[PDB]
Chain A
Amino acid sequence: GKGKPRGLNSARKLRVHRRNNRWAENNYKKRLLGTAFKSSPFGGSSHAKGIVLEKLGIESKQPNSAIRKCVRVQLIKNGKKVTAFVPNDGCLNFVDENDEVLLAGFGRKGKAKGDIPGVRFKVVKVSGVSLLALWKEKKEKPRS
């Protein structure tokens, strides 16, 4: 009958064994150990706000050739420095150094997006008025 015990009393061996082999289950592990809070730039939260340091242009990966415009951001609640990407054509023009931006993840549970090595987070809101609105031309950038 290969493996598992089948008796009517073997309940313990079975549930215990389940715990054990649950530990190889990635998602379970991470949820249990709490990598969520220990590791990870964000607290576990959806997003987090930080401040703009350097404006970096990362050369993309292969087989691709370009210059992915990015921003060095130091999380406010955290102090953790982390480099994010400024999406859409232009937009890097919108941000500037020493600014206060809202950062979101890149939908992969961590893991950098595409041809952009390292960058695990994108930008959403500079000076509190949303990238998109500006990049179109709805809102306009706050005073200072």
Chain B
Amino acid sequence: AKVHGSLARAGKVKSQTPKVEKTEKPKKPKGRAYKRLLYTRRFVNVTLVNGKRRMNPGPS
């Protein structure tokens, strides 16, 4: 069907969303030590057990 519609609005949403810049953070380990932080975090010390186990909850 129509092929010649408007084009002006091209790149609208990105170009109008407030550029909020990142926040400086602790350098996470790069490699085995990361797999270790993952091991202890996932399993060793454990976290919540509210029914089951949540891997990324916000205001839960």
Contact = CB atoms under 8 A, between A and B. Distances in A.
Interface of A: 55-59, 67, 69, 89-93, 117
A59 B13 CA distance: 18
B15 interface: yes
A59 B7 contact: no
Nearest to A67: B5
28 contacts: A55-B7, A56-B4, A57-B3, A57-B4, A57-B6, A57-B7, A58-B2, A58-B5, A59-B1, A59-B3, A59-B5, A67-B5, A67-B6, A67-B7, A67-B9, A69-B7, A69-B10, A89-B12, A89-B13, A89-B14, A90-B10, A90-B11, A90-B14, A90-B15, A91-B11, A92-B7, A92-B10, A93-B11
Interface string B1-33: 111111101111111000000000000000000
A92 B11 contact: yes
Contacts of B4: 56-57
Contacts of A69: 7, 10
The 6 closest A-B pairs by CB, nearest first: A90-B11, A57-B5, A92-B10, A59-B2, A89-B14, A57-B7
A110 to B, nearest CB: 20
B11 A58 contact: no
Nearest to B13: A89
A14 B11 CA distance: 60
Contacts of B6: 57, 67
